[PDB]
Amino acid sequence: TTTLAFRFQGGIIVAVDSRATAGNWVASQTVKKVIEINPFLLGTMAGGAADCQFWETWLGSQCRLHELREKERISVAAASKILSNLVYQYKGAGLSMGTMICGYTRKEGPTIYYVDSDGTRLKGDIFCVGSGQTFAYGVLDSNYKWDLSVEDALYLGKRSILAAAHRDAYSGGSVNLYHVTEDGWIYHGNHDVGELFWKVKEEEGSFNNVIG
Amino acid sequence: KTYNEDIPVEILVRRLSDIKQGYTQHGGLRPFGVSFIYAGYDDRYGYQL
Amino acid sequence: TTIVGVKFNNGVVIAADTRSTQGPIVADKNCAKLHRISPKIWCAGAGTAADTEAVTQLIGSNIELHSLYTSREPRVVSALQMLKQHLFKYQGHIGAYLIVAGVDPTGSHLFSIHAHGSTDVGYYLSLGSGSLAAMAVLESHWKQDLTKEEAIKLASDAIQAGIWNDLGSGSNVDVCVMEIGKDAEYLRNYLTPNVREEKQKSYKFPRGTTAVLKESIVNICDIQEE
Amino acid sequence: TQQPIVTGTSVISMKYDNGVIIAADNLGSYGSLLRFNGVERLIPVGDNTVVGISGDISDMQHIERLLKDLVTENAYDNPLADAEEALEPSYIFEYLATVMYQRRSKMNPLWNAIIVAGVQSNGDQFLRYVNLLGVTYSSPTLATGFGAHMANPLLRKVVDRESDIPKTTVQVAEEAIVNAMRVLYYRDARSSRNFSLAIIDKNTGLTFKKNLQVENMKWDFAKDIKGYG
Amino acid sequence: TSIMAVTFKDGVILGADSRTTTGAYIANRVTDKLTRVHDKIWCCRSGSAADTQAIADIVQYHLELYTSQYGTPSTETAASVFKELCYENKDNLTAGIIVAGYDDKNKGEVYTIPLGGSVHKLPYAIAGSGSTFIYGYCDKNFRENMSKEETVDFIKHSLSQAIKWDGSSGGVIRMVVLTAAGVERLIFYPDEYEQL
Amino acid sequence: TSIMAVTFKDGVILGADSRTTTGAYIANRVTDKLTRVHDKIWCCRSGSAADTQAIADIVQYHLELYTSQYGTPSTETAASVFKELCYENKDNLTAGIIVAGYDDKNKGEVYTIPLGGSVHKLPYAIAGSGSTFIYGYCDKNFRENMSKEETVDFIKHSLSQAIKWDGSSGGVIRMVVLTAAGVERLIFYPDEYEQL
Amino acid sequence: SDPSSINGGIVVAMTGKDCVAIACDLRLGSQSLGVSNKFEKIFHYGHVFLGITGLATDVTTLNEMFRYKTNLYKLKEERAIEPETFTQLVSSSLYERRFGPYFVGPVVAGINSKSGKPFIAGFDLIGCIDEAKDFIVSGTASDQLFGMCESLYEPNLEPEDLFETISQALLNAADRDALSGWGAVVYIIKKDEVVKRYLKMRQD
Amino acid sequence: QFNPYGDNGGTILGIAGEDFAVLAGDTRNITDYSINSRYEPKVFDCGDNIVMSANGFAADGDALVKRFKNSVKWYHFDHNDKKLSINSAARNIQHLLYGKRFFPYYVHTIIAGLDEDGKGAVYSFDPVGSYEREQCRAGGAAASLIMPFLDNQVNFKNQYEPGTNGKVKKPLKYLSVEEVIKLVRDSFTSATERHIQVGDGLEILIVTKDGVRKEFYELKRD
Amino acid sequence: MDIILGIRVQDSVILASSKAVTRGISVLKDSDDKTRQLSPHTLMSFAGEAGDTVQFAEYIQANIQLYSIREDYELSPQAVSSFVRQELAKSIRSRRPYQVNVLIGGYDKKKNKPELYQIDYLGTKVELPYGAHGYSGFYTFSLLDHHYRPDMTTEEGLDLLKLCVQELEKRMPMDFKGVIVKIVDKDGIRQVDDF
Amino acid sequence: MDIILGIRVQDSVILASSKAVTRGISVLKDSDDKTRQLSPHTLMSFAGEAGDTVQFAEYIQANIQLYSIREDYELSPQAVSSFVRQELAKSIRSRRPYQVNVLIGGYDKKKNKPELYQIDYLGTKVELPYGAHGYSGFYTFSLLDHHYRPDMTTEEGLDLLKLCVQELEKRMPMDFKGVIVKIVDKDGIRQVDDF
Known part of the structure; x- marks a missing residue:
């Protein structure tokens, strides 16, 4: 697990892994950690799998009855603030949560929020959550740039999960990238990590501690 | 075992002499009547006799 | 682990399974479980798998000593009283539950x-x-x-x-x-139930299927001299 | 937090060709103290089913009362359900089970094991199990408690699988049950000489024998057991 | 499990069951709980099974040597040996032994040792854990100085009650009779007292 | 304590002991454990002193209400009142109750109720803390349909053995005699039962 | 947590006809973090091959322990130790430290020079000799290994059928296990000739 | 004390095809080391070409097959004899599990059927809530034995063309309904010899565009 | 705990250890060295359990120097590492362990090559071209895969290291008040006064 | 982390709160703030446990604000603190607490006077000329009681906060990333950044 998102000039790149372990045993390699809340929101999966998968379908239920009543599309800050108050109730029942709600609207710009079981809500510009969130930060924050192209950003999201995936026990499977634009999320598809790796070892010339 | 390198010839030969010395030095026990010529190799000075 | 030891009129017969487990997983489909203290003192063991094999090997050692120090056959009691004594000191920290059986000059015996x-x-x-x-x-x-x-x-x-x-x-x-x-007869694999069916196909593979990164030859031999 | 106080044990059961035989020990232990003798625990429900209950005596008695009330609830209205469209094993069973599942939800369970065995109005042997957790399973030979390792292996000699339901007569089937009760009187500390054997045949009905002894008992081999040396 | 010993005119008669339960599964049912520790001094074992047997082997080692150097031990002597092993490892060795025996000079004597290790002389003893159901029976109908026939029924009848009320007591009733006539074993199978 | 009840041909006699320990200090050594819950249906309390008393109170409220609207209750009717309260609070409360009463059409009757509550008919019942010790003596010395004077003496002998072994029973032996004649109290002081 | 799952590791071993093969992964972790993709768990004393799984430090301790014992065997009796004789020494060394033991699970694999038979054996923590003439698997992906290995394997294989089977067996458990993989080395041990072949495989 | 969850073992295997679907399982029920029942289905038809097995602890595992079919009923009643999709049922199962999350079920559910495109579809749930679409997912106790051998014969996982040494991965192909009988029967042959909660019997349900077929094979009798 | 990174470039091993030492609630000292010179071309840096660290660093430095004055020939990095490995092995079997993680860098004058080694509290020796211990490790093993190249010079390697430090400084919630750098190379053991 | 300080000067309340949030084993934002306006001349800085801080910040805000439109009357900072404490006390007794510490700094319009109140998670207000919370509080206190004069101007209170900050960088074993200062004057609540 390791899921990161960064605002830049195009919107937000979301980038996720698909390895969902049970510990030592790797449960499945194709678990989606992106959750289409509506066509202008995506939510990452972190901590309890079950808790995030459920409640963000159910945020889709509150997105569609926000949309109807106000006849206007939901704010990203409003979306986050439904979810926050729900997990506060179930705190001390010990349900675990780790989600980034990512959205881009035209009346506020790109805005990420990190909704958490505590009731904690932090907006921001870079986050990474998971059991390998430490690896991911390193590469991403050195090579950070606000003024970046759509093409460079896609390679940068990939590459970040890669680094985490290689040392992290519980990261891998496949990565999936989305680019959230105004007009919707566009899917950039599925890349295997174990196949991405050797491409990136030749081209870049990184990983001189890794056999080959 | 402890240094993961094979014992120098100097070290192994001084060690044998010290056990032998010990019995003439203390305990009231006969000495061992033995004399060895050591043929041995190490990277440090090559062959030593 | 099912181990019977049944006495009868002219002797004793002791039989066991061939399954050795490690947790829920079957380590070995066939493994020995009957071991030999002495050629007339057999034993099988249940409980903890290592501590069956070693404790038999060990009181095995001292009886073989003892049988030759006495110039006579080693009795069932001889074995029994050393096992017993040895196990009590660790106060039940050595996990073994043995059926001990055997014949000797002073008859047929059977113990647990x-x-x-x-x-x-x-x-x-x-x-x-x-x-x-x-x-x-x-x-x-x-x-x-x-x-x-x-x-x-x-x-x-x-x-x-x-x-x-x-x-x-x-x-x-x-x-x-x-x-x-x-003579004491070992009939290992007396009765075979659960004989494994033919697998539905072969899962053999043509040459070259897997990918090698590199190859080498590494030496198991001593240094030679021409 | 549930804990039994007084306990009953061991009810064994098997299928045969034209029907089923169910039988149980009758002795209400209190751990070391063998405190009651004659505690019947073969409850006949209608005339085509015996329900044998094991575990806590307190819990058993409370579902003895439920069992009599099922028959009374069925007998309101329905003049054609007198005995001909009355209760089957399969219904009695289901009711039993769905009280126990519900009690497991609560975390205050009925701590019992229940065999239901009869013959249905279809003409089909029935033999099922439900217990304190509410695990269901059907099975051609069955036991409760510690006869699930003792009695069970021995009866699995006779009726192995579903291919041998009509090869075991009631002449074998009595004997096999008789023989288990004996092996249980030897190796189990909570069994008594008293046991009740009930035969459900479909052509002679519930024949309910009470207060059989375990007989033909060997203890002569104990005379040549001396000291260890 | 029930163990007992009763003094009578010609010596002392020892009595035991044979069921040894552990848990709900009876390991052995023909157990011989009556052990010879000399040749006229036999004991009765109850409690933690390995820890009683271990001690008994050591007591046997003590008395075999005692005989060979100093002369024949007494009931008193043997019981003392027993006590001092239970007493000095009294945290971990948990033993209730009834040491009963026939002296040629003082006749039968009985000692009872509970789990702490303190000797106490008694004209009959009961120790165990199936002997808490027959405590009031054993005292009311017991007489000191009974003839032989009487004694054998007294110990049978008690164990029959112990069998009945305690399910950790069962099987054969074993009796060993220690007298000047010698050492005689009797065995009573279940129908022979379940008849009563 | 040690409480018991024992039938005979005119009715049933109930038996008790008026020791009540809290630790080793006796809180009151003349507590009367024999309680009237209906005119002719009595009960015997044992175990925790609070607990038993609260339920005897509520069975007394429910037979006050039974007898005023549904005619006189039998030993049975009263028995199932006790059972159904002990079942519904066995993990909150603990009771041992022996229930003994006289019905006209069925004479003297004895029901027992362990801690989980189950109901079991018996011709004699024993419960309490000193009940363990006298079990085997009861089963030898008990008949059925015997004279009144023999029943008064069976109970005497049994609870004098109970006091002999158990610490937590002593003091006078009370008896309540339920017959068709009426209710007769008897009381035995220590020095009479101590000999017998 | 588990004292034998805190750096992971696996060893698979298979027999064939007239050949054996043994193989390990190259992963040393400290919990979640990968530290190294080049630590061996197979060692060779003579022509015997001893693969050692379990806790990181006891792999290494135990290697220098048997390094000591194998030297004294060879010096006295003037030959390289045989596979079958050695297995007995692997058992005793574990058992000596019966309490607080070495938290390993070695695999002995050889081909006897005195009879020409494939011979393999295994051990748990305390060490019970596990005979086989199939294959013995050990480590933290051993539940997977036991199923996977059995399914492909046909009783007796050719020296280079054996390379394709034991390679796939090892890959597929190792990419369904989190503490295994990350580069792996497979050995083919014939009579007199051992080849060490590293494997191309998933690093992520 | 009351420990309200036990286990009853069992092992199940769901394989999504391309014109059929396979949901299979064993019929052995256990508690500890005693065999309770040799035969006892766990793979129940629910109609509408959905087969469910909620496998593990039996008492939970029968509760979610009850509650599931109850909703198949009440759907068919209030939507004028609507055909229950795989999609609908999946999201409904999610709600039924998730609703007990302060006192969870302790089973491993897997469904199978055709989706709306004339291909197989298998969704597999954890006891808590979530789900994902599959092409293989075992469950149960001998999961970790059976899964990695299915990823090597269906998806061709880490295999390359012969004599290309890493250049090009081996091509995926379609598997016939016939072939997949062999794969499932062979996994449980290997499983029996190495695991002690599987054996006696194997009941495969195979789901097609004509109906559901039960097909029963024996395994080793221990 | 405290920072402890190694990075081995083609001609020098560059070790770095944290300045700050926090024992109690308060930083008590802000410039303490956490290294000991074993041999002229062998350096050992440490961080671990407070007060085991002082005793285990000084104990090993007595024994290695004793061996050096004996033969007048310093032991290889390879050897030093193994002796280090050996004690930590012994210390977890003993009654109370030494839980002190050490990075050993040395220039081997016999292979004429620089070499780096990592030995954890359990006692596992591993050769590595860069390494790290503790929580410090998590942010720099990924960043180091990106820029490291085996054939680097020392001054390139110093700016990489100041990149590594910078990443720790923000993302760590524990203060370290920058590193002190010490280089181990074939001309001796030198220091850098720039952070 | 959790550092909030108050320095009452004779014309201004100076509340400064932390720019770092730490959840998990890393810093997630190092550019954050932790203060909510109650009134247009009442400022509440809050800090303490995970996720009680936001949710209890906005709860109290809805409430003071409700009054203040309704009656178009500001509350006294005195009034305001009583309400906050009333809520905090109650939650210890109720099922679910709120472990959060608050400094409410305001400028009363009625008296024209700063007032600073320190409320702990238990709910005891106590008026202070200066106050802190957590272990951070320890370092700072000893400086305020040396150098404070109750005759201070706005700038003097700012220059004092520099000493407190400078001390915290040195002693504090953890990072905290500077502070945003907020001055509650009689004109507005105006933000300046300290260096």
């Missing part, structure tokens, strides 16, 4: 010993996880005064009760039949 130092005597005892099941079959068919050809059948059907109904037990059934003043 717990991990501390209880010892019991019947004309049929069983230990293991199979113990319960094994024991049921015995009490119905068994009588006093059984012949050899009788005995062996009683031993086999007794372990088979073990296999069907216990899950720590399975695979083949081993026997060792001892009669007084006749």
Whole structure:
């Protein structure tokens, strides 16, 4: 697990892994950690799998009855603030949560929020959550740039999960990238990590501690 | 075992002499009547006799 | 692990399973479980797998000593009293539950010993996880005064009760039949139930299927001189 | 947090060709103290089913009362359900089970094991199990408690699988049950000489024998057991 | 499990069951709980099974040597040996032994040792854990100085009650009779007292 | 304590002991454990002193209400009132109650109720803390349909053995005699039962 | 947590006809973090091959322990130790430290020079000799290994059928296990000739 | 004390095809080391070409097959004999599990059927809530034995063309309904010899565009 | 705990250890060295359990120097590492362990090559071209895969290291008040006064 | 982390709160703030446990604000603190607490006077000329009681906060990333950044 998102000039790149372990045993390699809340929101999966998968379908239920009543599309800050108050109730029942709600609207710009079981809500510009969130930060924050192209950003999201995936026990499977634009999320598809790796070892010339 | 390198010839030969010395030095026990010529190799000075 | 030890008129017959487990996973489909203290003192062991094999090897050691120091045959009691004593010191930190059987000049014997130092005597005892099941079959068919050809059948059907109904037990059934003043016969793999079907296909592979990164040849030989 | 106080044990059961035989020990232990003798626990429900209950005596008695009330609830209205469209094993069973599942939800369970065995109005042997957790399973031979390792292996000699339901007569089938009770009187500490054997045949009905002894007992081999040396 | 010993005119008669339960599964049912520790001094074992047997072997080692150097031990002597092993490892060795025996000079004597290890002389003893159901029976109908026939029934009848009320007591009733006539074993199978 | 009840041909006699320990200090050594819950249906309390008393109170409220609207209750009717309260609070409360009463059409009757509550008919019942010790003596010395004077003496002998072994029973032996004649109190002081 | 799952590791071993093969992964972790993709768990004393799984430090301790014992065997009796004789020494060394033991699970694999038979054996923590003439698997992906290995394997294989089977067996458990993989080395041990072949495989 | 969850073992295997679907399982029920029942289905038809097995602890595992079919009923009643999709049912199962999350079920559910495109579809749930679409997912106790051998014969996982040494991965192909019988029967042959909660019997349900077929094979009898 | 990174470039091993030492609630000292010179071309840096660290660093430095004055020939990095490995092995079997993680860098004058080694509290020796211990490890093993190249010079390697430090400084919630750098190379053991 | 300080000067309340949030084993934002306006001349800085801080910040805000439109009357900072404490006390007794510490700094319009109130998670207000919370509080206190004069101007209170900050960088074993200062004057609530 390791899921990161960064605002830049195009919107937000979301980038996720698909390895969902049970510990030592790797449960499945194709678990989606992106959750289409509506066509202008995506939510990452972190901590309890079950808790995030459920409640963000159910945020889709509150997105569609926000949309109807106000006849206007939901704010990203409003979306986050439904979810926050729900997990506060179930705190001390010990349900675990780790989600980034990512959205881009035209009346506020790109805005990420990190909704958490505590009731904690932090907006921001870079986050990474998971059991390998430490690896991911390193590469991403050195090579950070606000003024970046759509093409460079896609390679940068990939590459970040890669680094985490290689040392992290519980990261891998496949990565999936989305680019959230105004007009919707566009899917950039599925890349295997174990196949991405050797491409990136030749081209870049990184990983001189890794056999080959 | 402890240094993961094979014992120098100097070290192994001084060690044998010290056990032998010990019995003439203390305990009231006969000495061992033995004399060895050591043929041995190490990277440090090559062959030593 | 189902291990019976059934006494009979002219001897004793002790039979066991061939399954060795490590957790829920079956380590070995066939492994020995009957071991040999002395050529006339057999034993099988149940409980913790390492501590069965070593404690037999060890009181094995001292009896072989002892039989040759006395210039006489090693008695069933000789073994029994050393096992017993040895197990009590660690106060039941060494996990072994052995059926001890054997003949000697002073007759047929059959014992069981717990991990501390209880010892019991019947004309049929069983230990293991199979113990319960094994024991049921015995009490119905068994009588006093059984012949050899009788005995062996009683031993086999007794372990088979073990296999069907216990899950720590399975695979083949081993026997060792001892009669007084006749050679001790080891019939390993006496009765085979659960014979493995033919697999649906071969899962052999053409050459070159997997990818090598590099190859080398590495040396197991001593340095030579031309 | 549930804990039994007084306990009953061991009810064994098997199928045969034209029907089923169910039988149980009758002795209400209190751990070391063998405190009651004659505690019947073969409850006949209608005339085509015996329900044998094991575990806590307190819990058993409370579902003895439920059992009598099922028959009374069925007998309101329905003049054609007198005995001909009355209760089957399959219905009695289901009701039993769905009280126990519900109690497991609560975490205050009925701590019992229940065999239901009869013959249905279809003409089909029935033999099922439900217990304190509410695990269901059907099975051609069955036991409760500690006879699930003791009795069970021995009866699995006779009726192995579904291919041998019509090869075991009631002449074998009595004997096999008789023989288990004996092996249980030997190796189990909570069994008594008293046991009740009930035969459900479909052509002679519930024949309900009470207060059989365990006989033909060997203890002569104990005379040549001396000291360990 | 029930163990007992009763003094009578010609010596002392020892009595035991044979069921040894552990848990719900009876390991052995023909157990011989009556052990010879000399040749006229036999004991009765109850409690933690390996820890009673271990001690008994050591007591046997003590008395075999005692005989060979100093002369024949007494009931008193043997019981003392027993006590001092239970007493000095009294945290971990848990033993209730009834040491009963026939001296040629003082006749039968009985000692009872509970789990702490303190000797106490008694004209009959009961120790165990199936002997808490027959405590009031044993005292009311017991007489000191009974003839032989009487004694054998007294110990049978008690164990019959112990069998009945305690399910950790069962099987054969074993009796060993220690007298000047010698050492005689009797065995009573279940129908022979379940008849009563 | 040690409480018991024992039938005979005119009715049933109930038996008790008026020791009540809290630790080793006796809180009151003349507590009367024999309680009237209906005119002719009595009960015997044992175990925790609070607990038993609260339920005897509520069975007394429910037979006050039974007898005023549904005619006189039998031993049975009263028995099932006790059972159904003990079942519904066995993990909150603990009771041992022996229930003994006289019905006209069925004479004297004895029901027992262990801690989980179950109901069991018996011709004699024993419960309490000193009940364990006298079990085997009861089963030898008990008949049925015997004279009144023999029943008064069976109970005497049994609870004098109970006081002999158990610490937590002593003091006078009370008896309540339920017959068709009426209710007769008897009381035995220590020095009479101590000999017998 | 588990004292034998805190750096992971696996060893698979298979027999064939007239050949054996043994193989390990190259992963040393400290919990979640990968530290190294080049630590061996196979060692060779003579022509015997001893693969050692379990806790990181006891792999290494135990290697220098048997390094000591194998030297004294060879010096006295003037030959390289045989596979079968050695297995007994692997058992005893574990058992000596019966309490607080070495938290390993070695695999002995050889081909006897005195009889020409493939011979393999295994051990748990305390060490019970596990005979086989199939294959023995050990480590933290051993539940997977036991199923996977059995399914492909046909009783007796050719020296280079054996490279394709034991390679796939090892890959597929190792990419369904989190503490295994990350580069792996497979050995083919014939009579007199051992080849060490590293494997191309998933690093992520 | 009351420990309200036990286990009853069992092992199940769901394989999504391309014109059929396979949901299979064993019929052995256990508690500890005693075999309770040799035969006892766990793979129940629910109609509408959905087969469910909620496998593990039996008492939970029968509760979610009850509650599931109850909703198949009440759907068919209030939507004028609507055909229950795989999609609908999946999201409904999610709600039924998730609703007990302060006292969870302790089973491993897997469904199978055709989706709306004439291909197989298998969704597999954890006891808590979530789900994902599959092409293989075992469950149960001998999961970790059976899964990695199915990823090597269906998806061709880490296999390359012969004599290309890493250049090009081996091509995926379609598997016939016939072939997949062999794969499932072979996994449980290997499983029996190495695991002690599987055996006696194997009941495969195979789901097609004509109906559901039960097909029963024996395994080793221990 | 405290920072402890190694990075081995083609001609020098560059070790770095944290300045700050926090024992109690308060930083008590802000410039303490956490290294000991074993041999002229062998350096050992440490961080671990407070007060085991002082005793285990000084104990090993007595024994290695004793061996050096004996033969007048310093032991290889390879050897030093193994002796280090050996004690930590012994210390977890003993009654109370030494839980002190050490990075050993040395220039081997016999292979004429620089070499780096990592030995954890359990006692596992591993050769590595860069390494790290503790929580410090998590942010720099990924960043180091990106820019490391085996054939680097020392001054390139110093700016990489100041990149590594910078990443720790923000993302760590524990203060370290920058590193002190010490280089181990074939001309001796030198220091850098720039952070 | 959790550092909030108050320095009451004779014309201004100076509340400064932390720019770092730490959840998990890393810093997630190092550019954050932790203060909510109550009134247009009442400022509440809050800090303390995970996720009680936001949710209890906005709860109290809805409430003071409700009054203040309704009656178009500001509350006294005195009034305001009583309400906050009333809520905090109650939650210890109720099922679910709120472990959060608050400094409410305001400028009363009625008296024209700063007032600073320190409320702990238990709910005890106590008026202070200066106050802190957590272990951070320890370092700072000893400086305020040396150098404070109750006759201070706005700038003097700012220059004092520099000493407190400078101390915290040195002693504090953890990072905290500077502070945003907020001055509650009689004109507005005006933000300046300290260096």
